[PDB]
Amino acid sequence: TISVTTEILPVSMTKTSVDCTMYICGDSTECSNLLLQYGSFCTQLKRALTGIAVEQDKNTQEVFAQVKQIYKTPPIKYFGGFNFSQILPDPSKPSKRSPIEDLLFNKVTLLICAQKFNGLTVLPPLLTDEMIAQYTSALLAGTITSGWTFGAGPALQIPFPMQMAYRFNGIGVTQNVLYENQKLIANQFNSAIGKIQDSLSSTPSALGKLQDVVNHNAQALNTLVKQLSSKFGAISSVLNDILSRLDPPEAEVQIDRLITGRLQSLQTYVTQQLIRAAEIRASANLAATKMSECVLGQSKRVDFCGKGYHLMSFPQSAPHGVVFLHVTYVPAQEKNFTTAPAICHDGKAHFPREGVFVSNGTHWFVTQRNFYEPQIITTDNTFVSGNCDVVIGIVNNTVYDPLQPELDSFKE
Amino acid sequence: NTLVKQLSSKFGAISSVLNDILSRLDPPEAEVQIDRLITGRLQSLQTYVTQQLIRAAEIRASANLAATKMSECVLGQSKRVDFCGKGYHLMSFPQSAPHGVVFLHVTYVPAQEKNFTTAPAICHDGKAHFPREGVFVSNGTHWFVTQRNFYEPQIITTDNTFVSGNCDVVIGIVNNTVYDPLQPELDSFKE
Amino acid sequence: DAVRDPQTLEILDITPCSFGGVSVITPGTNTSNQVAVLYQGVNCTEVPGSNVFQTRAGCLIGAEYVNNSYECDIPIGAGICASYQTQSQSIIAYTMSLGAENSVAYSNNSIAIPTNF
Ligand SMILES: *[C@@H]1O[C@H](CO)[C@@H](O[C@@H]2O[C@H](CO)[C@@H](O)[C@H](O)[C@H]2NC(C)=O)[C@H](O)[C@H]1NC(C)=O
Ligand SMILES: *[C@@H]1O[C@H](CO)[C@@H](O[C@@H]2O[C@H](CO)[C@@H](O)[C@H](O)[C@H]2NC(C)=O)[C@H](O)[C@H]1NC(C)=O
Ligand SMILES: *[C@@H]1O[C@H](CO)[C@@H](O[C@@H]2O[C@H](CO)[C@@H](O)[C@H](O)[C@H]2NC(C)=O)[C@H](O)[C@H]1NC(C)=O
Ligand SMILES: *[C@@H]1O[C@H](CO)[C@@H](O[C@@H]2O[C@H](CO)[C@@H](O)[C@H](O)[C@H]2NC(C)=O)[C@H](O)[C@H]1NC(C)=O
Ligand SMILES: *[C@@H]1O[C@H](CO)[C@@H](O[C@@H]2O[C@H](CO)[C@@H](O)[C@H](O)[C@H]2NC(C)=O)[C@H](O)[C@H]1NC(C)=O
Ligand SMILES: *[C@@H]1O[C@H](CO)[C@@H](O)[C@H](O)[C@H]1NC(C)=O
Ligand SMILES: *[C@@H]1O[C@H](CO)[C@@H](O)[C@H](O)[C@H]1NC(C)=O
Ligand SMILES: *[C@@H]1O[C@H](CO)[C@@H](O)[C@H](O)[C@H]1NC(C)=O
Ligand SMILES: *[C@@H]1O[C@H](CO)[C@@H](O)[C@H](O)[C@H]1NC(C)=O
Ligand SMILES: *[C@@H]1O[C@H](CO)[C@@H](O)[C@H](O)[C@H]1NC(C)=O
Ligand SMILES: *[C@@H]1O[C@H](CO)[C@@H](O)[C@H](O)[C@H]1NC(C)=O
């Protein structure tokens, strides 16, 4: 059974910047002179947020920008009967995005913009959505046209059924299994893509991580703006009323507590953003590693690129994240048999070159491990090692020689 | 440097020097003069320690990645794609650096390309012949088998291929002759 | 956000000041001395000598938009990057080039095999 699963990984968040004077002081003059005496806190906060923004710009570059050249699919689209229409971009839409990417964009929902006008500025990302989609399309065209050859060096053309035969040969299944079951595997793959198209749409809690990222950013900015209107043990929370009602020698000490409160709130916001940036960096590094291993090649690591024996992976872009579609091979309907470690023929122990000795109850065969394909035990399927009295569990059988009867028939 | 510069601030006090304040006033409000200096310097120290903790947390992850790369790339050969350099990994060499390590990754890259005609299987006597390892390659006239990552054509023999099924189920099978190395030597020397 | 006028019974919406950050774009100080100026997130009708360009990131003054595409050198944002080059020497702004465009001649009976390494 061919199975196709999802994995959603956040890659970045929103880039933000804050002003020293404007947030703490509402364009007051003496407030600036009082804030200047404290030192250089907001220089450190500005450098921290600038480093965070540069890191967030680098995070998306380390994941998507991994191809040397931009690839395209041929205008004719027939890949061995496999049908890739759900992941390739649709030229009818003015944005070259697949139906899966359109569904992921419409699923994530990004007056509150005017409230963040107290020194807070949201900076746009360097890479826009169309450019990231062009990277995604180039990766898809490279991985369905050239296989894993373009990830190491120059791209080498190969037919897709032969690429599937190569991928089967890497998980312990001989390539004759695919070529004798091409239509069934193509139908299973198409059915899996058709099911996973609306598996995300049926459940509204699938894209929890990206929504959590945008909600965390929104509530952090919102609670900063809320805390801007607090009193911190003063007579008033607005500077213009308190400066214009008391004389400066008492107004100074009365607004110093406002300065300290707003400064501490800024420090808390910057520290929380730094911790979230570290977490997002770890997630982006994991996503970049998964793009390098699952998409550009075949991974032998267990449960890394999905559940089961890994076959391929396809990348899709999402708001502040990436989605991997892992295509894996899963075993199915089982049969049990009696097995032996070796075969005794003429006082010599015969061990399988590759596979396993199987009996239905009457005769003995040798077959490959992950698929039932019994064959006659010949002298080329086995190798001789030692005598018969050292291996326990050895059984009585014969080994057919494809050489002796040809000579004793043809020579005479 | 920022810590040492910040040490010379006032934080709302009359002076930035403790000895200047102490020799200027009497104690019972010199203590409230210096309490603001105390608050500012504790805040500065806590900020510095928090930043150092975050930077050390980042440095730990970088060092763990470096240790993993030293264990995998240098002490063995890695099959992970684009881990120990670009291309098929061959070797790696470590070098020391001030507060860091430098890995020299030796890898293998294909250089010059040619295209041929390919088939998934070969039909000989109503039976399908699949490659044991490699790929079927035609220059235009005859058919050979070769390994994947290097061009090395060889005559299609009965030891380079294996038999699986008849000649009616594989899409794209072509007609060819598989040379048996056994029967000409037995048709020459027996007679 | 909005107020009623006390004399005429009228809705008035209030929007606060534009403001924003200013940034400078320069090459190395030994290469040249001329710079470009970026005003972040503002419309170019609120900035007060030609070569004024409107960008989704902001307003850019001192650099000219070129329809060609190159590798990014100094990033502004929204796919816009600046560089110092001839056309004598000047600072230009452009859209990023992702890479060389390539076509792979895929076919159902063709394979490519390397002959050298
Ligand atoms: C690949 O899958 C797509 C999507 O299911 C198929 O497009 C459908 O084709 C049928 C038959 O003409 C139409 O009724 C549907 O409306 C099409 N769907 C869409 C979304 O356009 C497509 O035919 C498949 N490709 C092949 C070669 O069979
Ligand atoms: C497997 O075959 C061997 C063939 O030699 C059997 O061993 C012989 O069994 C007979 C009958 O009991 C004895 O007379 C011989 O002395 C045995 N020879 C040896 C070398 O032990 C053997 O019994 C068969 N079965 C198993 C389970 O091993
Ligand atoms: C494909 O390769 C075969 C390899 O045998 C080429 O056939 C040989 O060509 C050379 C050069 O003329 C002759 O000296 C040999 O006698 C040929 N061998 C045989 C068995 O006939 C063949 O020419 C190649 N085809 C192309 C189009 O280059
Ligand atoms: C070469 O391949 C062809 C098909 O391209 C085979 O021709 C078939 O042969 C069988 C058995 O003789 C006939 O029943 C079919 O009618 C043939 N098909 C066609 C389309 O003609 C042929 O057997 C292969 N081998 C040789 C030696 O010619
Ligand atoms: C593979 O490429 C190498 C270079 O990477 C080729 O070696 C060159 O061979 C020519 C012809 O003899 C010499 O003039 C050059 O000096 C060689 N270069 C180097 C770096 O040694 C080699 O010939 C190529 N192999 C094949 C089979 O084409
Ligand atoms: C297969 O297992 C079942 C129990 O699960 C057992 O009854 C049966 O005999 C086994 N078959 C063979 C051929 O050993
Ligand atoms: C086991 O397989 C062989 C294959 O020749 C067959 O003859 C035999 O009947 C099978 N055993 C049973 C119990 O069906
Ligand atoms: C190799 O590819 C080129 C185009 O890249 C094509 O013209 C040529 O026919 C191909 N050669 C063969 C033998 O198929
Ligand atoms: C105030 O005076 C203006 C003068 O034109 C008039 O239109 C308006 O209706 C007056 N106020 C009220 C509350 O009606
Ligand atoms: C800038 O203001 C002008 C004048 O109102 C307007 O036409 C233009 O669309 C504005 N530009 C942007 C990018 O909003
Ligand atoms: C191989 O390619 C052509 C053109 O893309 C396609 O229509 C055809 O079905 C394939 N060839 C055969 C013999 O099936």
UniProtKB/Swiss-Prot annotation, chain A:
Glycosylation sites: N83, N336, N360, N396
Region (Heptad repeat 1) location: 182-232
Effect of L243F: In strain: Omicron/BA.1
Superkingdom field: Viruses
Disulfide bonds: C20-C42, C25-C31, C294-C305, C344-C388
Site (Cleavage): R97, S98
Chain coiled-coil ranges: 211-255
Effect recorded for E354K: In strain: Theta/P.3
Role summary: Precursor of the fusion protein processed in the biosynthesis of the S protein and the formation of virus particle. Mediates fusion of the virion and cellular membranes by functioning as a class I viral fusion protein. Contains two viral fusion peptides that are unmasked after cleavage. The S2/S2' cleavage occurs during virus entry at the cell membrane by host TMPRSS2 or during endocytosis by host CSTL.
Protein name listed in UniProt: Spike protein S2
Organism, scientific name: Severe acute respiratory syndrome coronavirus 2
Gene name per UniProt: S
Span of the entire protein shown here: 719 to 1150 of 1273
